[PDB]
Design a binder for this molecule. Structure first.
Ligand code: YL7
Lengths: 297, 298
């Protein structure tokens, strides 16, 4: 089962941010609220916004920040890349221990989808190799954040800014730097060609085994380089030696050598599933990391 | 589409741990009552067929250890409601949300906050199968984890976890302690009925495909509900109820496609197969999204 981190620590930080006729979500940590800077745009602005220009023309009192029924007074504002930072006069007592991180493609994270400052749903995503994320984000979701929880610490890794015409999504880290070649303007943008996260497919196959599913296994083996040749042919990421290392615990747990699973994946790529499913799916799933699988088994 | 859970924070604020001896499971702390599975009072010698009523008479308030984190909550009364233990505690939970206890129907979905020793580990979306099992992720120590939906500010609690079956699926009760399905809280091998496909959710999925402009499978014909139900059962699909017909109303309205017309389209897919075609990027029909789930993500 695809499993998200419990979202309570993040729900206590979500607020609503309005400028003009534009409302989206912000993240309130300590006495600062972080949100996408395109909240300051209007219809005409959005096509080619000169954000520094638009921002200097704004006053602190142009920002309406609401935490539920309560309006927070903005006592200062600044911009860090694509993220607007609003200083408010009061600190959030619900602020958890946190940090800002930039995740690598193939890493997963939970998304708390929010609208008008209110949490609506939580789900698990992966950072695609082409730096998109396949999410459920509608109008008004901008400022929703993605995160992981290690111990009692929330690592914020994603803030949501836009949809692409293919229906995937793009956004920034909490320093305001986009993942991928995207820009926060109202244009149709295309991503690089997406590739499949191989180490995650391998983790998922080990999971199907742990759960007693093994029809796809074979007795064949393969070298790492010969597997990577076939992987790349089918637009799968090559498997690094650290990726192999990371798969050790699942290998140990099932007694299936990593390169043996690679030989099984190779057969699937070349032949398909021929009606058969794995863990219920007709497709090879690649949004489960080794850690995600282990933690759940 | 994707499975999307409700935000879990209102439920996290209610999770505690309940311990008898060395046996620790999770409980749900609402106002001044903690709810947990009664088998917290079982020993290993008792697991195969406990006498819960006799096991409880031997129990006093001061034998129950209830903790929120490392903070003890003193128990001041206890009772048993079916398969659930109710422990009155001396502190009202300040984080109690608006809530209700609901008993859901097969096919309905809900979020599960998987907890261990009172600490949440993850949240995910489950479907109650037509045979009253759920396909969860539960390890040892997960009992007492709850399933819920959130409507506005109000948490509807619908599931409490009690056990695993040989097939690897899971079974449990509502918050009044009544099992879903024919199962009992004893350490015995129990078999669920044969699982069937959740027809109402497949229909919801077809509506979702139509809303997104994927509508090759729509035909010019209709059927009666009885005719559809009789065919459906031959393909191991659940028959539709009047409540199923009714909760498809909004999607029927959104699309202008009568429920019974969508049933005729489904019938043709069941009889003729997909013919190497996809619906929403899939050769498989999905049955774990309810009409409400579809509306949420659309
Ligand atoms: C903020 O809430 C919003 C979220 C997206 C709206 C619908 N699904 C979403 O994920 N963000 C925006 O609307 C973006 C604002 C820009 C100034 C960055 N724009 C956007 O998502 O639309 C992209 C676009 C533009 C033109 C043609 C196609 C297309 F996809």
């Amino acid at each position: 089962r695809k499993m998200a981190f419990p979202s309570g620590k993040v729900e206590g930080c979500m607020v609503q941010v309005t400028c003009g006729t534009t409302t989206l979500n912000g993240l309130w940590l300590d006495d600062v609220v972080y949100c996408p800077r395109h909240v300051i745009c209007t219809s005409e602005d959005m096509l080619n916004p000169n954000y520094e220009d638009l921002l200097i023309r704004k006053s602190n009192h142009n920002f309406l920040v609401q935490a539920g029924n309560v309006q927070l007074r903005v006592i200062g504002h600044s911009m860090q890349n694509c993220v607007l930072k609003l200083k408010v006069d009061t600190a959030n007592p619900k602020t958890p221990k946190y940090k800002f991180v930039r995740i690598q493609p193939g890493q997963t994270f939970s998304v708390l989808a929010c609208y008008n400052g209110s949490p609506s749903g939580v789900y698990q995503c992966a950072m695609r190799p082409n730096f998109t994320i396949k999410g459920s984000f509608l109008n008004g979701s901008c400022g929703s954040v993605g995160f992981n929880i290690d111990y009692d610490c929330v690592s914020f890794c994603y803030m949501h800014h836009m949809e692409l015409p293919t229906g995937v999504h793009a956004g920034t880290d909490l320093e305001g730097n986009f993942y991928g070649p995207f820009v926060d303007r109202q244009t149709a943008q295309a991503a690089g060609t997406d590739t499949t996260i191989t180490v995650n497919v391998l983790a998922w196959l080990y999971a199907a085994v742990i759960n007693g599913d093994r029809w796809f296994l074979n007795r064949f083996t393969t070298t790492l380089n010969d597997f990577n040749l076939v992987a790349m042919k089918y637009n799968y990421e090559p498997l690094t030696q650290d990726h192999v290392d990371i798969l050790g615990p699942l290998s140990a747990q099932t007694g299936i050598a990593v390169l043996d699973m690679c030989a099984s994946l190779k057969e699937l790529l070349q032949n398909g599933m021929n009606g058969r499913t794995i863990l219920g799916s007709a497709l090879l799933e690649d949004e489960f990391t080794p850690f995600d699988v282990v933690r759940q088994c």
